[PDB]
Structure 1
Amino acid sequence: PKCPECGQHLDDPNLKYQQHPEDAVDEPQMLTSEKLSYEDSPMHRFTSFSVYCSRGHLCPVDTGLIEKNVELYFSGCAKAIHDENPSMEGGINGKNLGPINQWWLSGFDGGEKVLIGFSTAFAEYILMEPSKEYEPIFGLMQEKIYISKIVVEFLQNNPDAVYEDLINKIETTVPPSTINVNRFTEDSLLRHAQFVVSQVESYDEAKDDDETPIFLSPCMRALIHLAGVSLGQRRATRAPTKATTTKLVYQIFDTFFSEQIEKRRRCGVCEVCQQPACLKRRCPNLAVKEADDDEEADDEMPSPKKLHQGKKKKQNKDRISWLGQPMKIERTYYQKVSIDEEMLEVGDCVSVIPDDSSKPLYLARVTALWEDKNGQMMFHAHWFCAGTDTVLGATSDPLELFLVGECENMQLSYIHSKVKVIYKAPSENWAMEGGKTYFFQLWYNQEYARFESPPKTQPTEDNKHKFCLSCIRLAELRQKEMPKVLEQIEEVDGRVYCSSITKNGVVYRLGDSVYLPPEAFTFNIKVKKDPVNETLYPEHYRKYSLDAPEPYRIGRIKEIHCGKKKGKVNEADIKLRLYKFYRPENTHRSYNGSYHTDINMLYWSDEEAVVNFSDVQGRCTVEYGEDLLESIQDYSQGGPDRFYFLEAYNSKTKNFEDPPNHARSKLPKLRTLDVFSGCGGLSEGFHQAGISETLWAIEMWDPAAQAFRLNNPGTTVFTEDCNVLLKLVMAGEVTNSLGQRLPQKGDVEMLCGGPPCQGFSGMNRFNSRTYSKFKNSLVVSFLSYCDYYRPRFFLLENVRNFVSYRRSMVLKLTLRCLVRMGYQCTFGVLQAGQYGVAQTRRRAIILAAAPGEKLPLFPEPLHVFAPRACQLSVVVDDKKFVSNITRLSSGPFRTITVRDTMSDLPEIQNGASNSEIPYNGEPLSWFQRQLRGSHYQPILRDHICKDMSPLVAARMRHIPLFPGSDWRDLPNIQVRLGDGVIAHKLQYTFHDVKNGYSSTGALRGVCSCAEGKACDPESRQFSTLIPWCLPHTGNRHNHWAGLYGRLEWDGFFSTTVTNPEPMGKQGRVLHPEQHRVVSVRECARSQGFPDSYRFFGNILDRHRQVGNAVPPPLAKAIGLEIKLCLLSSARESASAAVKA
């Protein structure tokens, strides 16, 4: 019993038949009425409507029957186009009104004007209210339509919105009384995914701009993949931001566009492709792939080859003759001047023509001039680097050269011409200056991509002739790397026993402690599943289609025994006898040691080991706790590489005895402005490192600016657009609107900030479209703040991919900009997890130091972390750039786990709303002890989590506790959803040709596409415990591994969480044990925020605050590198005040 025209089942109890009114005259006759008074189709209103098949069954319109060619007829009261009355008053009745040509919509912009309309070969109709009988059908259609309105209006306002932003928008929208639904959930969006998506695509075709289609925003692409959407199904129709630049900054971006600015695998299958300068044949399937592809980068390639090592051509010899008297005599005889038709003097610059493999004319500075024992007239060439050959490439000034550590001896014959090379030195008031020939400003380090201030070491009279800065640089480096013996005692055999040695500029005496790889030495050693019920766990079959290393070994120096090279000591074969230290985990305690133990603590062991000095990783202080003048806490925080012991451990007895007797015995706070401050995470870390004071912050979002105020009372927190506050200082205004005191030149010592990269964040080459955005971006505004203020220190923090955006053009242009201003600058990727947080998050960091200060290094990882997460290198124009970081893999401390992070917090349930609750317990882990304080605090603030819908909540309760459990572990069971609502079972009705049958011979398919056919809609199940969408799109998305996943106690957070959603893109977000999502505080702990840190606004505002922040431990680490630059520069002036 099915309809041969509309398909509807006759046994369906919701089926209804059409009932005509009397008047009911057919379409043509109805249309010739005087009740009626810009298109060749009469437009009229239409109330009390009903849609039906030739057989008379009331029909939906949204179901695609019209498209499947099925003739649909209608009836009701036709009224006048201006008549707003939804009653059958001023109107004629019509019946079986001509087969519906197509249906349409309008009002996707202005007011709540969403009008539904029908089109017939006779006329156009603007549907008013439906008939009694047809009302429920038009009712479901009304829902579908409202959701589509919310989505479209939200996307016009908020493009760039992420999946979690949409879910919140939908969940939060209060539908009018007229809609039969109380509120829309994620379950609704998934149910009407095909409708919504096809409507969002329709809006794009309809109103036309040069702007990005709305179906391509992140939330929309996330929906398309998660739900099983078929793109391309067509339907219905109906001044730019200016950056406050400085002259300098403007010209860089201006003089880049005005140069570099130049100018397809379509699916075929879709309805868009299957249609014919008219063009709107833009394949949605290709568009999605392209947009998804543009979001991915390339993370290994060899060390870049050193320049100037190619062949050179010789110039013809006319007259080459020395002028003046020899400067010195060494087998070699130096001279101040030489003749080569014209005059060349020690210190001039020359051009050397190479074997033109690209034709780039080589440039050098004439270091020395001499005549070798064979009468060959030589010169030493200290090579220059063309800007187009530094990281900068094409963006650089073509007249700009750079100093390098590249120099070689050559015959005077290679010289083609003497070249004028000017040093563009900084002014006396370079700091107050904010707004032809070859020149150079900086010294470039190819490997690490550091532009720094020229050495400024002047020639001694002993080497006034031979003076090469590259030779001096190489010298220092070779002698620092060198393993040399400082003081030697007495030899036994052919091995000399010493009291002190050195390497990497670190001095190692006897009794000092050392770091070593875990493979250096050893300690004293130690010594199958059953079938699943597949009817109950039908998705578990999907469960099957390198971890963190060990921290350093530690030992105290007993002997420095050595070897002998014929005459003296064999500097290479320095050996070390050491006393082994155990970490509580190394001990029989193992994993049970590592919990409550101070990350700092060790145990003494009379055990001995011999290793090479070449394996020593560094020095560290291991002291006895009872022979300490301060408390362990005071000691441990006092400085880096500080470890302690209070007991000793006998491996044989497995006992802890007291240790033996032989085991015993101002900083300038830079005045900071933090643009795009947030709640102050970066300001916090920098405050902890002691290097700063944040007196000014700029944050446009009220809840964040409020939260920054709470935590920094001394700060002037501006909430105006930074572009306005800049135009205001560049006008002499001393105060803003509220009368807040504007910072001026000299006030700001350090400038930091995280500029958003809104409309250009993508990997492909620039366009007219993408450049436009970047040209006036906050990156441009931020660089301008740097140019006007001329701060001593600068930091631009961002997502790691900032380094790869637009073929690295965002990075290259940022560096070029810093260079034109005259700054020492560099870049690097850092992994948050390596500095003490239970989270994998990389960040691009752009450091800059003013001429006069020194350019800081990137900090050495303090924590051992998984290698997969620590991919720190950057490819720029197919050359591999690396930072000064040496600790590739290892480090002094064990990883910080989710357990360390939150194992102390008291239980909370889903929807937990009390912001101020007792702790109900003491801290457990070392980490917890740190963020809580070494005292008593009563209140636990922000241990608050989202009230998830009864459906989500029920799923969370059914996720098991075993580490690694996600949605694949859910049971296929009916659950009473708190209210009247009942979460039903997922029906397996299709074959999965690729996945086979279950162990019970059951089907695994959930949609017709599992069999290779097209999707059959309304095979689409909703309000199921196992979400229908997941088996639907599983095979193409790695079985959505992690979705509804609980964090592992031993694990970490996947990324910075800003809004936890179980089917989102922010990773495993459920609590390891409790039937809820991670709390605001749990996230704050993942970010290494002290427990006393304050947040502001509603729950979501507090989640976004926490998640948007730079983790304070990463900022402390960076801050401490600034510490060394300050200390080092403060003592350099002091050891020069004496010489003056």
Structure 2
Amino acid sequence: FYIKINEDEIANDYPLPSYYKTSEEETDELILYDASYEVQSEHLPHRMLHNWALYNSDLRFISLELLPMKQCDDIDVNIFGSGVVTDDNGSWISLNMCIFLSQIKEWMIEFGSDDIISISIRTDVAWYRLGKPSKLYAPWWKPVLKTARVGISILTFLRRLSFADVTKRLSGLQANDKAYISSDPLAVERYLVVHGQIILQLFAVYPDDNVKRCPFVVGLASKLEDRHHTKWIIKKKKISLKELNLNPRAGMAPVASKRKAMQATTTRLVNRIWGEFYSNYSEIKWDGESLGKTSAGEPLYQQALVGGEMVAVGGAVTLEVDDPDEMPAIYFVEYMFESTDHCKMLHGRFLQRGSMTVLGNAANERELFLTNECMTTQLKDIKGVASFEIRSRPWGHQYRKKNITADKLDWARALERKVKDLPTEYYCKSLYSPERGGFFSLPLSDIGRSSGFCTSCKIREDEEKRSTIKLNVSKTGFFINGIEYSVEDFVYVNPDSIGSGRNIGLRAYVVCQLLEIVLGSFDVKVRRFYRPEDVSAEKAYASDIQELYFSQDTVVLPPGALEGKCEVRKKSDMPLSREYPISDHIFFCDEIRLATLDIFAGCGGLSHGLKKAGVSDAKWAIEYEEPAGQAFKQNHPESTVFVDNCNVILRAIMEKGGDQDDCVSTTEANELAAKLTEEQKSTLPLPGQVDFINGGPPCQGFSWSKVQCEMILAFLSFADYFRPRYFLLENVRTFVSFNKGQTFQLTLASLLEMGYQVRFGILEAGAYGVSQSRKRAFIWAAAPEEVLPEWPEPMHVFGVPKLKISLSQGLHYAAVRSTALGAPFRPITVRDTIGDLPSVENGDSRTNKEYKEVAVSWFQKEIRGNTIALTDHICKAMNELNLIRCKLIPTRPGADWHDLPKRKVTLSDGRVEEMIPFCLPNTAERHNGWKGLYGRLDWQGNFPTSVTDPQPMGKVGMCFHPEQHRILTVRECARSQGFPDSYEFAGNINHKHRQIGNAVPPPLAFALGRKLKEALHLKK
């Protein structure tokens, strides 16, 4: 009989589960060898194996101790392996063609000198001496050696004793020794009894016979019986080679891997900026006569002499503040007058330094920014004057060279002005606004008027007047938060003020009608409306998004419970344009289009939304992979899609433009560009024909030699070269936190240096109509003569706190308000998205089908439309074990692998495997019990983060249909993102899943495009 210890006992000494991966094809083991008649355990050939790796059927790394150390027939556990086979040669270990094996039968250890051990593996075909292991399998090999150490040392001590004495004598040795185990006797006893087979074989293999008869070995053999284990039998039968290879990867063609990255081709400006950053950081009198009088009669002047220095409107003065180590502040003066007290007042606006802004250390040293804050002081004492000027340059792609030629010269002067120890001359080009989070354009007509009227002061006074509730003269309305409320209006009330499962139980705005009025010493009495969700979930599922019900409930509230105004219309006259997502606060009860250029196009969700908005038409495109380019061509036939690498399309464009000296490129880029034919070269766009550039580079990760392949430098170079009237950048939420946010600051600095007005924001798509949580970072950029678009207003309640970008000096900016408190419309659940699709079986492959059930939900109605050809309703396939595991998970929400019963299942192939997929170590740092794996969804919940590859092998997460025992299909994943049912995808299932995963929800792009159209309609 043989005693085999279960993996749970030794799991405490082994790391967390990890799965085997490879990229090179292998050959079957049985092919190489003859597989002759039955022979003894010695006649098999002896060879060595390097780079070994052992795993179970699930391709999960397993320990060597799971293999019996003697000959047994009814082996209940099957372990497979891989490596490289070489001719045998004597090589020991003391202290420091690819081939996958068949089922592994046994392992044997032999002892040599005082510190010489050897291990070998026997299969049904031949022996294999053991060598160096793989880098991934190293952690699973350390304990096996460690226990061996525990043996070796104690042997040197045996040269007639009880069992506890050796334990207490071992518990006292210091932790610095290589044989240290633990000081607690219980721990040393447990470890000694849990790895008893290895040291038992070591004792039984020793040349000396006296050690074999020590009571230690028999006592340990007796005590091995108590705990969890299994029992086998021992026999010396002749092994038969008649078998077939049963490796899980008998087929399993290698997955594409090692997609190499190369240096990006850029222009001079962007490369210069990023490289420069990363190389170093990784007697007072008046002048003239009076010009007028203020509102109170104070005469105003325009010029003064202070200590010999000249002060005038448009200059800059310096004050004094505490902490003298800090530099003094700068104030741009607006007007200076004389008061009734025969004193000289002045009014100034603070000019912030770049280093205190969002840019941080990436900001320009000589660039100051106008601020909203302003103050008045006395002209009597001012540290001094400072050189200052407002910079304004013409816009266009034809001035670019000129705009460059001056800059160096300017910088040259600065360098000289730093060499000669002269005061630095500052400048201001834009207006920094942290309260809006952006660098807007200077209102040149409203600054330095010397009239006694200050625009910023009036704005602050109006804002102070705002939020102060005051009654109206007619006693029928009031003014609160800038809103003029009156009788017979419709108002929003917070749900609390009225007496995954992230959004479960979340309510929305309560719509009420003002009844009457009962500083601020009054209250409001209003009526009550009801929502379909207030009845049942079924009623809310099959009802319009804007439906409402009437009730006669009247209630009185303080004026602070109102959030805005809404409109209620009869069910006979609507705007007649069912736009989606909705942007108009309306309920019911009863010639500007610009030529664009899409970079990193993908499938084209963003381009689809922008075109649907009406401000874009995809006249050109750039992609990398064939299936994505084919899909983009299919969906947008009029676009001229370029499939060749983008990093060389820029080189081709520059070469066509005759400025090859202003484009740094690799040697391969020139050869690739020269290989293009004549039609594609003639189709390339030229500067001046592009008025919109959008796209998102794939820069995700956590130094100059590495950040030169981020793929965003090429995007910045494209924007610099073409100089469109508008620019859009999109990336992941964590884009503003890579390398402590250095890349985001650098992108902002480059955009400012080119000359745009930029603004940034983190937007959650779930509040705009989609049913999937997805947060993205967006950057808008506009020309100085245009108007930067405003951020769209979310309309759906979704539970997520305010997503704030961290400014400098403890400041946060939130682009949009958090919609968890309330919103006009309810969120979208799982059943509202993919409920109507017909059921499919596991591993379906029919691309074209026919719809079976009519649309019920508002989302289904708005996303189906009139198409009658179901496309890409296919899902991946599971093997026997995975399908059986899937079938055992209940349909309740929140289910995971914790509900899988503990047992072993024999497959039809002829293998026995454990049902439990993982063996986590007890008393370890396994967060939340590894929940979420093998998990179903919820009908009323929301979709989790979309994975680019939901894989049915190994560690499979929450990607299961709530009812059917399968994985979600391609069409369901597309629908969860808001993609219209008429959209087309190309490639195999993996490529389509990757295409859908990387796509941006079309509704968000439509909202951004609508805001851009509103901005464009206002330039006049």
TM-score, normalised with respect to structure 2: 0.70
Question: Cα offset for 1:854?
Answer: 1.5
SS in 2 for 1:423: coil
Residue 745 of structure 1 corresponds to 687
Residue 435 of structure 2 corresponds to 447
Deviations 1:328-368 (A, max 9, x none): 24274432222212321223211223223541221111112
Change (3 A) 1:636 1:1041: closer
Report whether the alignment pairs 1:382 with 2:349.
yes
Any residues of structure 2 matched to 1:650-1049 within 5 Å, and which? 668-732=592-656, 737=677, 739-740=679-680, 741-757=683-699, 761-762=701-702, 768=703, 771-867=704-800, 870-877=801-808, 879-889=810-820, 890-933=822-865, 935=866, 937-975=867-905, 977=907, 979-981=908-910, 984=912, 1023-1030=913-920, 1036-1049=926-939
| CA distance in 2: counterparts of 1:669 and 1:959, whole angstroms | 52
The one-letter code of the counterpart of 2:968 is V
| CA distance in 2: counterparts of 1:404 and 1:497, whole angstroms | 39
Question: Cα offset for 1:478?
Answer: 4.5
Residue 188 of structure 2 corresponds to none
Residue 644 of structure 1 corresponds to 588
| CA distance in 2: counterparts of 1:332 and 1:733, whole angstroms | 61
Question: Cα offset for 1:928?
Answer: 1.0
Match of 1:1071 among 950, 961, 971: 961
Any residues of structure 2 matched to 1:496-515 within 5 Å, and which? 496-498=475-477, 508=485, 510-515=487-492
Question: Cα offset for 1:595?
Answer: 0.7
Deviations 1:143-197 (A, max 9, x none): x999999xxxxxxxxxxxxxxxxxxxxxxxxxxxx993464299999xxxxxxxx
Change (3 A) 1:457 1:475: farther
Question: Cα offset for 1:946?
Answer: 0.4
Any residues of structure 2 matched to 1:515-664 within 5 Å, and which? 515-522=492-499, 547=504, 549-559=506-516, 561=517, 572=520, 576-586=524-534, 589-625=535-571, 627-628=572-573, 634=578, 639-646=583-590
| CA distance in 1: counterparts of 2:798 and 2:482, whole angstroms | 27
The one-letter code of the counterpart of 1:885 is V
SS in 1 for 2:384: strand
| CA distance in 2: counterparts of 1:911 and 1:521, whole angstroms | 51
Question: Cα offset for 1:415?
Answer: 1.4
The one-letter code of the counterpart of 2:588 is Y
Residue 249 of structure 2 corresponds to 184
Question: Cα offset for 1:3?
Answer: 12
Change (3 A) 1:670 1:922: same
SS in 1 for 2:780: strand
Question: Cα offset for 1:1034?
Answer: 7.8
Any residues of structure 2 matched to 1:87-486 within 5 Å, and which? 100-101=92-93, 136=125, 138=127, 180-181=245-246, 183-184=248-249, 241-261=262-282, 318-321=283-286, 323-325=288-290, 327-329=292-294, 330=296, 332-340=298-306, 341-429=308-396, 433=400, 436=414, 437-458=425-446, 464-475=450-461, 477-478=463-464
Question: Cα offset for 1:864?
Answer: 0.8
Contact 1:954 1:975 in 2 (8 A): no
SS in 1 for 2:937: coil
Deviations 1:666-705 (A, max 9, x none): 6x23322221111011112223333322222211011111
Contact 1:973 1:1025 in 2 (8 A): yes
Contact 1:548 1:865 in 2 (8 A): no
SS in 2 for 1:851: coil
Residue 297 of structure 1 corresponds to none
TM-score, normalised with respect to structure 1: 0.63
Question: Cα offset for 1:502?
Answer: 5.5
Question: Cα offset for 1:1033?
Answer: 9.6
Contact 1:520 1:553 in 2 (8 A): no
Question: Cα offset for 1:326?
Answer: 5.8
| CA distance in 1: counterparts of 2:490 and 2:692, whole angstroms | 36
Change (3 A) 1:672 1:181: farther
| CA distance in 2: counterparts of 1:861 and 1:1119, whole angstroms | 14
Report whether the alignment pairs 1:1112 with 2:997.
no
| CA distance in 2: counterparts of 1:103 and 1:346, whole angstroms | 81
| CA distance in 1: counterparts of 2:689 and 2:904, whole angstroms | 66
Change (3 A) 1:866 1:704: same
Question: Cα offset for 1:726?
Answer: 1.4
Question: Cα offset for 1:439?
Answer: 0.9
SS in 2 for 1:617: strand
| CA distance in 1: counterparts of 2:129 and 2:686, whole angstroms | 61
| CA distance in 1: counterparts of 2:341 and 2:441, whole angstroms | 39
Residue 12 of structure 2 corresponds to none
Change (3 A) 1:373 1:392: same
Question: Cα offset for 1:1050?
Answer: 1.3
Question: Cα offset for 1:805?
Answer: 0.5
Contact 2:313 2:450 in 1 (8 A): no
Deviations 1:260-294 (A, max 9, x none): 13xxxxxxxxxxxxxxxxxxxxxxxxxxxxxxxxx
Contact 1:50 1:134 in 2 (8 A): no
| CA distance in 2: counterparts of 1:485 and 1:107, whole angstroms | 85
SS in 2 for 1:136: coil
Question: Cα offset for 1:802?
Answer: 0.5
Contact 1:943 1:1082 in 2 (8 A): yes
Contact 2:48 2:86 in 1 (8 A): no
Change (3 A) 1:643 1:333: same
| CA distance in 1: counterparts of 2:561 and 2:715, whole angstroms | 44
Change (3 A) 1:730 1:553: same
Change (3 A) 1:136 1:1085: same
Question: Cα offset for 1:426?
Answer: 2.8
The one-letter code of the counterpart of 1:580 is R
| CA distance in 2: counterparts of 1:747 and 1:504, whole angstroms | 45
SS in 2 for 1:1027: coil
Change (3 A) 1:355 1:603: same
Q: Give aligned pairs, total.
A: 795
Contact 2:581 2:769 in 1 (8 A): no
SS in 2 for 1:593: helix
Contact 1:873 1:880 in 2 (8 A): no
User: 683-692 or 1085-1094: which moved more?
Assistant: 683-692
Question: Cα offset for 1:927?
Answer: 0.9
Residue 82 of structure 1 corresponds to none
Q: Which runs of 5+ in 1 are unaligned?
A: 5-14, 22-46, 52-61, 71-84, 88-93, 109-117, 123-129, 150-177, 190-213, 219-238, 262-317, 490-495, 523-542, 563-569, 647-665, 763-767, 985-1022, 1134-1140
Contact 2:476 2:486 in 1 (8 A): no
SS in 2 for 1:795: strand
| CA distance in 2: counterparts of 1:407 and 1:179, whole angstroms | 85
Question: Cα offset for 1:520?
Answer: 3.8
SS in 2 for 1:440: coil
| CA distance in 1: counterparts of 2:915 and 2:129, whole angstroms | 23
